[PDB]
């Protein structure tokens, strides 16, 4: 993630934009090690249904 | 508004940061005087310290600008220091091109041109000082000529500058063979305007001749005074 | 919001370039009517005084090159640079393509210009419209005008500077397509003299030329003193 | 090729002429410019003095007269002092006011030489200056004029001529 | 700006395929010339003046590339002028010298002008010479062109210490009559120019100065037409 | 915050450059149309103007058309830019510019002049139609002076541009395009008289300005 | 430090204002403070750069 | 620092605010006049001087553009002097080293008041606050006389009068001019008008008068090739000033 | 009137009397430093500053304040950290290119002004801030001992003692007494200006001085016996 | 309240003659995370706390080597630490190529002091906001360099900056005369260092993750130690 | 002007200069005055400076230049390549002539805007 104040973090899971702040409880409460592709493609969408 | 913080037309048709720059060449509060002999030119300057532990030799408002041409700033030194330089440069570099000696009113042009840009441009202040040329031309003989902030420069007979010119100038107009003479006769004319004694360490002298423009040491200054006491 | 001319205020509008379209409506009237076979260039010599030259001090009406005119409302002394510029930029189409400039292309570029100014900060807008009148043989005799917002428009009979208004309304009620270029004199004359504030429109207030047949003839006042008495003004 | 062309100017009583042998002979105004050379180089300086002479038209509302014409080529042509134009320029006309018939030549560069009887450049010029000394005489009439001036442009090397009054000029053309 | 080599990889590829004196005097310098200009082997014109004017009291005569010393005084004589405008005083002759030979050494003697300035200034008269190169040298007589040599052995003959007003023109003149009959690039007649302290330059042109009418229609016509201006 | 291009809004946009698009909402009308195979542009246009030596619709090139809304000057000057790009991409180049291409520069070109305090931003929006040299997909693109360009089916940018672009939102469909040139003539044409100039772009640099729309207005006004 | 509605808060205010609210509110101090700082910094106008704008 | 901001813009009501307050400076400045004969042209102003102290020599307001024109000012010398000396350079380069010959009046004043037009739209320097009254001959155009302004706005006058007697100069001027005017004439009328305007003494040294008149061949320096004549600028000497005073 | 509110915001302004008030307010900032004194001897000069310590963590033999421009040049400035430092290596660099070119240590006049151009160039414009130290500067060359001591202004005149800083009014009034008292041997004046600077005042006094005889010309440091009587003396 | 009308830019004095825009620099720095720094006579230790934007993300670097013989620590602004890290290690790099030698530490941390320092004097740009602890060991030795964004750079023993950084500032005072008389035993160093930062601490404890430590001495090349191998330490 | 559609080649239509033909390899072969007369001014003026520093120390020169680029930058005239007024003066070329002032020296890329852009950079 490359904010404009010209930093750079690396993230396991990360939302940005409107409703980021959502996005980002919800991935601290869902995301593990063992996420499987498949799941986090879903994951994401799930994300998406509720800050879109 | 800007008016008064930049150098451009205030409603009234007057430039406010230009004539302040005037009242800035008083601070220092100190006065001088040149006049014209017959074939030298003579400028006094007063020289209060005032401190007793600030040295009067390096305190001197006389500057040797060129072999013949010297000038004595009224103002604060920082900005006469600047100036001086320039004019010390803009002599040399007329004699190379031109391939002879710096006049003296030329001198105050470039400078006094220079000066013009100040009070045009926005972001170049004025610089603050009145400058007097002093030197005798081999063309014009003896001539003094002075620039001020705002751009102007002009011949003058005899000239006084400082918080008290009005009262020097009035004496000379009322008064209108070695510049020893022109010394003392400036000196007094001085003292009687002011009413206050010199001695070695009150003043500075610079003298224009033919050959060279110098400035009088403290000991000559005292030689000067004690011709005077003599009278 | 009217400090710079690179600041849009709320409402999206540039004051700046406003304020400069105002100062034009202070200056002297300029009037241009185009007839079926030429055109006529008017203007009311706002600054006036008995000491002043009349003749030989054109300053509303210039040539700019063989076959176009303006006529220069607002302030002179920015016209003078635009005006060398279109005297040397219509020589270099002619040094280039060996042919007169036409003049939609000569607006354009004169237009793009005062544009320019009101798109940088340290320009300010020219404060001065146009009415050019040329021939070529794209379209023949047209009429144009240009503003300090740089933006032009074709006109049949035009008037600018000060009481446009009034001037352009005589203009619509008056104007005929199929007239000739003496009628469009007597119009010319007859719009200016009920508009100006003046209480007579005399010669030595008024200037004249005229492009038709292909000659432009700026009136000497000798005979814009004819033309007036032959109008009846 | 249409390079090297020959002209001639001479001048006569109130009157002058020019001749050579596509124009090489070009008018701004009342003054006449002859052009010899580079026929690129003469396309060139048409087109730049007829740029500066049309500006100056403008600005002055005046016609430029020839001898200042003849000063304006001559800065023109020290421009690109280095790689000059490949021409030796003639000009002629009449002052309008003076009315003293005027004609000058010049090199590459510029030099102004202001004769009073008569300019030739271009090629084959070398034949030209001592046919038009021989047959040149001051203060020929236009038509005694025409003559000398033909005569000399003929024998020396079609051709035209170009016969300045003071508000009329004729154009001839020479077997 | 400037000169602008516009064309000289054009021109480069297309080629692919007079007598002058100064003399110094007592109360002044006068400047001699003569009148011949030569393109080549002809006489290109003849009765040419050859001293230029770069003020009042300072003329100037050059030779080598005609337009170049024609080009380059008149450019100094305008720096003299505004000059003298500048500083209210009438110009000096060094000053002429400095940017004169400051100016040609800026073109590397590319700008060919060959020139002997003399004038008379405040501070007296003077009589110098310059080479394309900025190079001068100052001397009470000089002499320049192809028939300097000539010249010269006239002045060094004749000439001495403080000459006469009247000497030194009948030297100066006699001394380029004997380059016009000696050298073949000078001829016609004498150009003289005195400059004096107290008086103003007296330009003495032509100081020295040493029927096939046809019938009218013996040229056929072809045509003939009316030009209108 | 309002008098600066360099200076973010505490909300986190920048208000000198939305005043821009107020200036583009002051200016006259332009509306665009996407067909299955063609694009229209119908444009809003007194008594003594000379109507001969006047088309609000510019073509950038023989395939490509750029109508505009808002200060006309800028457009002006905005549209020769274009131009130059487009030819000078076709030298650079052998193929026509493509009209996203176009776009994109007018676009970096209006975002070019938002990247300074002392230059005034383009005050005009851009309405890029045309076709892909050598294919029969439409194309129509929207630039800001923000710099922003986006593909729309049908935009209308101008005066009364709400109104109008909710007119077109509920009778265009994006899965029912129209079909016919006469199809989306008649929608851009009812879509200019819920407040006339109507440009028909056809693949193959075929251009054509409608001349007599009256009948498609008598036709629509009945109905 | 802020207009109003903007207000930014150092991320020691933010230790020492969930530990001392805790006191009057009662809640289990370290599970609160647990529950506060994943909402403080993870994504909130409150945080706003610091959390990535300071080394 | 790309750019800076223009320090002339128009105010709400459409004008300049610099370029009036330029004027203004105008006004408040010296007082200063110009005839133009049918034979010459008469150019005049009084000097002011800070002290009496101060070489009137020095004090040359009438300056010397080429040897057929001339020029007055009044407002701020330091402007009008920088101006002159970029007027002489610009009849150099444009005119007479591309033509040969020094510039007429016309364009003179048309070069001078470019100079002034283009620090009335620029970022750094404020207008020129001096309007210079430009007097010359041209063998064509003939005796002219131009009141340039500090908005670059030049106008042909007859006679004209600029400073702070500039209006009752100019009525004075008024009923005090003819077609028929002879330049001795004029320098009479011109003496006259500048009187009434000078507050205090009035002689030849606090008066300087300029003539733009017949050719002065003493003036020129050299003899020879007469077709290079004298000039025609001349500034009349304060001893003549003060014989045609007392006339 | 100390403020001139309206103008003072901006540089290179003059007031309605004339003052250019960032100047002025630059001259504030020097008034706040550790009190800086330097006194003229017959054969030398004489530097004293009153370093305040801050912490233990600091080295003691690199914390030095009292810079050395040139081997024959001692400098010591009160004020802004970030000037007085900027001006040193300002002013080092034009004694190193003097002696470069002229193959001559720099006359301490001749430095003096090349410094003062320097810091008055700062109060021409008003991207720039005039520099906000008091700079004492002297040494020894052909011409002898000098002194000397520039403003912020950029004003310097030659002295025979000077004094800035916080401690400067008392440093002053001593330092007058004792140029009246003794109208200086280097050696003598170490004792003195440690005196001076001790009546002046956690605090550590730190000495240096330049003379012809006892160093050669050369700058050193007090260190040792010498600096220990002068704390005795004190 | 009149703070606000001289606080507008670092080219302002205030009438009582503070540069406020530099001073808010200066506190910029209490923003960053604490960092330690420490040194004996012959071996320097660098200790960071490092911080993570969410748990999510990885902990933020804030240690750099600029060569193998010296590195540096980071405290405040993210854009200026990295401007100033990369151009020393711009400088590390370009001495050695013209010249061959090592840049020693000492040069290295005033040669960026110029850079700092002009900032603060112009207008448009603005102080740095970063404040940096130098660690080296050359020639002559152990070196701990602090720089802070007005162009102050103090060698030191030991120091703390960043966020709390006086409690470890005050523990190092409480154990100097410890800390320097460990010599020759790295392990020992490191472990009062990382004591030393273990007092700035309010709720987070020390982890393998968010500790950074390094260390360099005469036998120790620049080593930063992170991750498991930071675990012995704690 | 580099191309916009590729950021590697003149872009030789906005470049008017006679097609792509000036190719840049062949801009080599140049007269032996051109280099040296081009840039004559500038090494004087640099060679002025230089003097300056070793004199009147780095100050002069600082002070100067910044004059200098004060007017030069707050001049903007896209409508005239004449130098400032105020140029000359500090220059010192108020009194003087040169071939560069007497000889100062198309429809696509002359316009204002093309030197707003380059003025500012934009």
């Not at chain 6, 023989?62 to 274009?82: M, P, Q, T, Y």
């Not at chain 8, 006679?159 to 001019?177: D, M, N, P």
Request: charged share 25%; net charge negative.
């Amino acid at each position: 993630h490359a904010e404009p104040s010209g930093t750079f973090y690396r993230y396991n899971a990360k939302a940005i934009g409107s409703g980021s702040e959502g996005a980002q409880a919800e991935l601290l409460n869902e995301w593990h090690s063992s996420l499987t592709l498949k799941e986090a493609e879903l994951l994401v969408l799930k994300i998406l249904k509720q800050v879109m | 508004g800007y008016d008064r913080h930049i150098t451009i037309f205030s409603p009234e048709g007057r430039l406010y940061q230009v004539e302040y720059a005037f009242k800035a060449t008083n601070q220092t509060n100190i006065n001088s005087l040149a006049v014209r002999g017959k074939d030298c030119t003579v400028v006094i300057s007063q020289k209060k310290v005032p401190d007793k532990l600030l040295d009067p030799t390096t305190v001197s408002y006389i500057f040797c600008i060129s072999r013949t041409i010297g000038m004595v700033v009224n103002g604060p030194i920082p900005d006469a220091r600047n100036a001086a330089l320039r004019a010390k440069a803009e002599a040399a570099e007329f004699r190379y091109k031109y391939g002879y000696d710096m006049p003296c009113d030329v001198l105050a042009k470039r400078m006094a041109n220079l000066s013009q840009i100040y009070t045009q441009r926005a972001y170049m202040r004025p610089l603050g000082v009145i400058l007097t040329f002093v030197s005798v031309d081999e063309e014009l003989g003896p001539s003094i000529y002075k620039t001020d902030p705002a751009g102007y420069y002009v011949g003058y007979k005899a000239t006084a500058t400082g918080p008290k010119q009005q009262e020097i100038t009035t004496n000379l107009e009322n008064h209108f063979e070695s510049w020893e003479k022109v010394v003392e006769f400036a000196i007094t004319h001085m003292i009687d305007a002011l009413g206050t004694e010199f001695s070695k360490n009150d003043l500075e002298v610079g003298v224009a001749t033919k050959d060279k423009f110098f400035t009088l040491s403290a000991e000559n200054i005292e030689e000067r005074l004690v011709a005077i006491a003599e009278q | 919001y009217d400090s710079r001319t690179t600041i849009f205020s709320p409402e999206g509008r540039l004051y700046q370039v406003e304020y400069a379209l105002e100062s034009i409506s202070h200056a002297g009237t300029a009037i241009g009517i185009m007839a079926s076979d030429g055109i006529v260039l008017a203007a009311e010599r706002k600054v006036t005084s008995t000491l002043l030259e009349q003749d030989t001090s054109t300053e509303k009406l210039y040539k700019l090159n063989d076959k176009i005119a303006v006529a220069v409302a607002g302030l002179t002394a920015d016209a003078e640079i635009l005006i060398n510029t279109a005297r040397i930029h219509a020589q270099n189409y002619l040094k280039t393509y060996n042919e007169d400039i036409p003049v939609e292309i000569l607006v354009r570029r004169l237009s793009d210009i005062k544009q320019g100014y009101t798109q940088h900060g340290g320009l300010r807008p020219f404060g001065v419209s146009f009415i050019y009148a040329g021939y070529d043989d794209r379209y023949g005799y047209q009429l144009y005008t240009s503003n300090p917002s740089g933006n032009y428009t074709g006109w049949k009979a035009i008037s600018v500077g000060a009481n446009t208004s009034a001037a352009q309304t005589l203009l619509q009620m008056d104007y005929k397509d199929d007239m000739k270029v003496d009628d469009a004199i007597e119009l010319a004359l007859k719009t200016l003299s009920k508009t100006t504030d003046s209480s007579a429109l005399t010669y030595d207030r008024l200037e004249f030329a005229t492009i038709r047949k292909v000659y432009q003839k700026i009136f000497k006042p000798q005979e814009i003193k004819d033309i007036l008495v032959k109008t009846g003004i | 090729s249409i390079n090297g062309g020959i002209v001639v100017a001479m001048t006569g009583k109130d009157c002058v002429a020019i001749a050579c042998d596509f124009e090489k002979i070009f008018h701004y105004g009342h003054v006449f410019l002859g052009i010899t050379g580079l026929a690129t180089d003469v396309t060139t300086l048409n087109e730049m003095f007829r740029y500066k002479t049309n500006l100056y038209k403008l600005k002055e509302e005046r016609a430029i007269e020839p001898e200042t014409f003849t000063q304006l080529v001559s800065s023109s042509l020290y421009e690109r002092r280095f790689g000059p134009y490949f021409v030796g320029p003639v000009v002629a006309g009449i002052n309008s006011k003076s009315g003293k018939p005027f004609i000058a030549g010049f090199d590459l560069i510029g030099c102004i030489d202001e004769a009073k009887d008569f300019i030739v450049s271009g090629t084959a010029s070398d034949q030209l200056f001592g046919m038009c000394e021989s047959l040149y005489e001051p203060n020929l009439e236009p038509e005694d004029l025409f003559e000398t001036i033909s005569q000399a442009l003929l024998n020396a090397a079609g051709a035209v001529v170009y016969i300045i009054k003071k508000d009329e000029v004729v154009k001839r053309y020479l077997k | 700006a400037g000169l602008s080599f516009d064309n000289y990889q054009r021109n480069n590829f297309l080629a692919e395929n007079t007598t002058i004196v100064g003399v110094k005097f007592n109360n002044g310098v006068v400047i001699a010339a003569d009148t011949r200009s030569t393109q080549g082997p002809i006489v290109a014109d003849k009765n040419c003046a050859k001293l230029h004017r770069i003020s009042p009291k300072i003329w100037c005569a050059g030779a080598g590339t005609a337009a170049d010393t024609e080009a380059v005084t008149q450019l100094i004589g305008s720096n003299i002028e505004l000059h003298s405008l500048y500083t209210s005083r009438e110009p000096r002759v060094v000053s002429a010298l400095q940017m004169l030979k400051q100016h040609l050494f800026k073109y590397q003697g590319h700008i060919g002008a060959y020139l002997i300035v003399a004038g008379v200034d405040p501070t007296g008269s003077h009589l110098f010479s310059i080479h394309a190169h900025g190079s001068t040298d100052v001397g009470y007589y000089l002499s320049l062109g192809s028939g300097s040599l000539a010249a010269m052995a006239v002045l060094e003959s004749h000439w001495k210490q403080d000459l006469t007003k009247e000497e030194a023109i009948k030297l100066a003149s006699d001394a380029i009559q004997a380059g016009i009959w000696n050298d073949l690039g000078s001829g016609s007649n004498v150009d003289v120019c005195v400059m004096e302290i107290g008086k103003d330059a007296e330009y003495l042109r032509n100081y020295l100065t040493p029927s096939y009418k046809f019938p009218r229609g013996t040229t056929a016509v072809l045509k003939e037409s009316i030009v209108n201006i | 915050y309002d008098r600066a291009l360099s200076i973010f809004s505490p909300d986190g946009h920048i208000f000198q450059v939305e005043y821009a698009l107020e200036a583009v909402k002051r200016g006259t009308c332009a509306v665009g149309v996407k067909g299955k195979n063609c694009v229209v542009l119908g444009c809003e246009r007194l008594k003594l103007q000379d109507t001969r030596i006047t088309s609000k619709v510019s073509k950038i090139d023989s395939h490509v058309v750029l109508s505009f809304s808002g200060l006309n000057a800028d457009s002006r000057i905005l549209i020769e830019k274009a131009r130059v790009e487009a030819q000078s991409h076709r030298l650079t180049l052998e193929d026509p510019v493509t009209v996203e291409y176009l776009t994109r520069y007018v676009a970096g070109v209006q975002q070019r002049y938002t990247q300074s305090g002392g230059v005034r931003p383009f005050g005009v929006s851009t309405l890029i139609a045309g076709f892909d040299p050598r294919d029969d997909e439409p194309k129509l693109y929207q630039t800001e002076p923000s710099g922003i360009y986006s593909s729309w089916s049908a935009q209308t940018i101008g005066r009364n541009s709400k109104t109008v672009r909710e007119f077109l939102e509920k009778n265009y469909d994006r899965k029912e395009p129209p079909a016919t040139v006469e199809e989306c003539v008649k929608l851009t044409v009812r879509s200019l008289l819920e407040v006339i100039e109507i440009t028909v772009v056809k693949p193959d640099s075929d251009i054509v300005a409608l001349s007599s729309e009256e009948i498609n207005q008598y036709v629509t006004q009945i109905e | 430090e802020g207009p109003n509605g903007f207000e930014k808060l150092s991320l020691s205010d933010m230790g020492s204002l969930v530990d001392l609210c805790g006191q009057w509110l009662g809640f289990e101090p370290s599970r609160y403070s647990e529950e506060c700082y994943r909402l403080w910094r993870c994504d909130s106008a409150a945080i706003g750069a610091q959390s990535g704008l300071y080394i | 620092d790309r750019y800076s901001f223009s320090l002339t813009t128009f105010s709400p009501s459409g004008k300049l605010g610099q370029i009036d307050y330029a004027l203004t400076a105008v006004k408040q400045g010296v007082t200063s006049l110009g005839i133009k004969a049918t034979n010459g042209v008469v150019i005049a102003t009084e000097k002011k001087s800070s002290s009496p102290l101060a070489m009137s020599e020095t004090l040359s307001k009438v300056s010397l553009l080429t040897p057929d024109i001339g020029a007055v000012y009044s407002g701020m010398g330091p402007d009008y002097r920088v101006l002159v000396d970029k007027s002489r350079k610009v009849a150099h380069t444009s005119y007479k080293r591309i033509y040969g010959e020094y510039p007429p009046t016309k364009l003179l004043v048309s070069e001078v008041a470019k100079i002034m037009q283009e620090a009335t739209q620029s970022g750094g320097v404020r207008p020129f606050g001096v309007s210079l009254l430009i007097a010359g001959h041209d063998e064509f155009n003939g005796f002219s006389l131009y009141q340039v302004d500090p908005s670059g706005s030049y106008f042909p006058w007859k006679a004209t009068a600029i400073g702070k007697g500039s209006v009752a100069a100019k009525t004075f001027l008024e009923k005090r001019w003819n077609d028929e005017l002879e330049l001795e004439d004029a320098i009479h009328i011109a003496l006259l008008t500048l009187k009434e305007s000078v507050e205090g003494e009035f002689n030849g040294d606090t008066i300087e008068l300029a003539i733009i008149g017949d050719e002065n061949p003493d003036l020129l320096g050299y003899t020879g090739i007469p077709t290079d004549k004298g000039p025609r600028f001349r500034k009349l000497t304060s001893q003549e000033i003060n014989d045609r005073l007392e006339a | 009137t100390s403020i001139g509110t309206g103008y003072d915001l901006s540089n290179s302004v003059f007031s309605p009397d004339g003052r250019n008030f960032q100047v002025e307010y630059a001259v504030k900032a020097v008034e706040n430093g550790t009190t800086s004194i330097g006194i003229k001897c017959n054969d030398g000069v004489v530097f004293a500053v009153e370093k305040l310590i801050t912490s233990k963590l600091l080295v003691p033999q690199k914390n030095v304040k009292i810079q050395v421009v040139d081997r024959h040049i001692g400098c010591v400035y009160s004020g802004l950290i970030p000037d007085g430092r900027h001006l040193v290596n300002r002013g080092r660099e034009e004694a190193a290119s003097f002696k470069k070119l002229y193959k001559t240590p720099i006359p301490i006049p001749a430095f003096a002004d090349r410094l003062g151009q320097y810091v008055q160039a700062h109060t021409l414009y008003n991207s720039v801030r005039p520099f906000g130290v008091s700079t004492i500067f002297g040494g020894v060359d052909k011409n002898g001992a000098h002194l000397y001591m520039l403003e912020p202004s950029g004003s310097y005149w030659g002295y025979k003692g000077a004094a800035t800083g916080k401690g400067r009014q008392s440093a002053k009034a001593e330092l007058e007494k004792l140029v009246d008292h003794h109208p200086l041997s280097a050696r003598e004046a170490v004792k003195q200006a440690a005196k001076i600077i001790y009546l002046a005042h956690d605090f550590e006094l730190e000495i240096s001085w330049c003379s012809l005889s006892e160093t050669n010309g050369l700058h050193k440091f007090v260190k040792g016996d010498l600096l220990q009587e002068a704390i005795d003396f004190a | 309240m009149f703070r606000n009308n001289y606080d507008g830019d670092t080219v302002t004095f205030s009438p009582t003659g503070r540069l406020f825009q530099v001073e808010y620099a200066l506190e910029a720095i209490k923003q960053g995370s604490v960092t330690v720094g420490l040194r004996s006579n012959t071996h320097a230790v660098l200790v960071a706390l490092k911080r993570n934007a969410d748990e999510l993300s990885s902990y933020q670097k804030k240690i750099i080597k600029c060569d193998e013989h010296m590195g540096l620590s980071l405290a405040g602004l993210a854009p200026d630490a990295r401007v100033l890290s990369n151009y020393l290690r711009q400088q590390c790099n370009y001495s050695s190529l013209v010249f061959n030698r090592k840049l020693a530490v000492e040069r290295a941390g005033h040669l960026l002091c110029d850079k700092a320092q002009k900032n603060t004097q112009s207008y448009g740009g603005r102080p740095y906001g970063v404040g940096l602890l130098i660690i080296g060991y050359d020639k002559s030795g152990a070196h701990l360099l602090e720089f802070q964004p007005s162009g102050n750079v103090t060698e030191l023993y030991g120091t703390a900056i960043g966020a709390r950084s006086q409690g470890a500032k005050t523990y190092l005072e409480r154990t100097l005369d410890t800390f320097i008389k460990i010599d020759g035993n790295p392990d020992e160093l490191i472990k009062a260092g990382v004591e030393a930062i273990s007092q700035s601490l309010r709720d987070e404890s020390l982890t393998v993750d968010n500790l950074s430590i390094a260390i360099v001495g005469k036998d120790t090349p620049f080593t930063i130690y992170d991750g498991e191998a930071v675990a012995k330490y704690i | 002007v580099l191309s916009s559609a590729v950021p590697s080649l003149p872009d030789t239509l906005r470049q008017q200069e006679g097609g792509a033909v000036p190719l840049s390899t062949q801009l080599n072969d140049r007269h032996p005055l051109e280099s040296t007369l081009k840039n004559w001014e500038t090494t004087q003026r640099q060679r002025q400076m230089e003097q300056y520093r070793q004199i009147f120390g780095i100050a002069e020169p600082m002070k100067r230049t910044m004059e200098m680029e004060i007017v030069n930058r707050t001049d903007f005239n896209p409508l005239s390549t004449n130098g400032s007024i105020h140029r000359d003066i500090l220059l010192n070329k108020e009194c003087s002539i040169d071939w560069e002032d007497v000889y100062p020296g198309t429809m696509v890329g002359d316009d204002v805007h093309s030197k707003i852009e380059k003025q500012l950079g934009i």
